[PDB]
């Protein structure tokens, strides 16, 4: 249905092992009046995002990470997390020497709610929804405490020195994480966000390791997402195991980025792979589900929304080599479930 130039390439919306977002748009549900926060590298000023981006906030405290000249500020612009000369560091490993800017937060944001039916570029899973960019990641990643403050604020939590969020999110997408157990502080903020009514949707990670060995997956009250391929099998790099709740397409995912290698230069589109790409598919479907639930006067708690998403998955291609939740997220079965 969408008129967008490169929609045809987004197999992950509509093909055999896609999320069946097409079958839900056919029902008139697009995630209208749903707000999804993206706790990530920030947002590009991209012709195929602008319309669907709401005021966010920049939680990065170290100015050597943010690359914008100060700590916390009201502008969640992705300056570009590029680096060279082993700035992150790991010298002398040549594979850690340098990286071009990822535009990670925008690729993720486009999956959720890229401007759709405007002819240019691509579509989003919940293109009737809106995105609040919570910038917590810059050069070399981010601090746990910036991430945790950011996710609490995303839900509507007040933080001293930060103007109240006018746009609290029902769904908080965290395409991020690292090695180690969930911290006391991060768990606490997740629990407070969940009590505010937000579903916290997180990436399993990309180290071909048991996702239980990582945060946010090892936290309570998150929905952890593994990555599958166009063939319906576990993508090679996807973390795995009992604490992965479900999976979504995380290989050859087309979305919105910039062509700049350092700072933004011009709007572009690219294929990426990672549980990071899978995660916003689930965040996008969560928003579709909520817009369907709204239409029948049905409120859903984060726990209930998570159960709908996990219980209505489509099957994998055979069994997998590792556990990856119940199936692949399925917007049609998820939405049909809440409409009776
Ligand atoms: Ca700043
Ligand atoms: Ca900023
Ligand atoms: Ca578009």
Numbering used by the authors: 2 to 341
List sentences quoted exactly from the publication behind this structure.
Dichelobacter nodosus is a Gram negative, anaerobic rod that is the principal causative agent of ovine footrot, a debilitating disease of the hoof of ruminants. In strains that cause virulent footrot these proteases are called acidic protease isoenzymes 2 and 5 from virulent strains (AprV2 and AprV5) and basic protease from virulent strains (BprV). All of these proteases are synthesised as inactive precursors with an N-terminal pre-pro-region, a serine protease domain and a C-terminal domain of unknown function. AprV2 adopts a subtilisin-like fold consisting of a curved six-stranded parallel beta sheet sandwiched between two and five alpha helices.
To investigate how the single amino acid difference (Y92R) between the active forms of AprV2 and AprB2 alters the substrate specificity of AprB2 we determined the crystal structures of AprV2 and AprB2 to 2.0 Å and 1.7 Å, respectively. The two structures were very similar (RMSD of 0.28 Å for 339 Cα) and therefore we will describe the structure with reference to AprV2. The proteases have two disulphide bonds, Cys89-Cys141 and Cys183-Cys220 and three calcium binding sites. The most striking feature of the substrate binding site is a large, elongated S1 binding pocket, which is lined by residues 177–180, 204–208, 215 and 218, and appears capable of accommodating bulky side-chains such as phenylalanine. This finding is consistent with previous studies, which have shown that AprV2 preferentially cleaves after phenylalanine or leucine residues. Comparison with other subtilisin-like proteases reveals several major insertions (termed I1-I4) in the loops that surround the active site cleft. Most notable is the large well ordered I2 loop (residues 82–102) that is tethered to the subtilisin-like fold by a disulphide bond between Cys141 and Cys89. The loop is well defined in the electron density, with low B-factors, suggesting that it has limited mobility in the crystal structure. However, the apparent stability of the I2 loop is likely to arise from crystal packing and it is uncertain if this conformation would be favoured in solution. We therefore propose that the I2 loop functions as an exosite, mediating the formation of a stable enzyme-substrate complex.
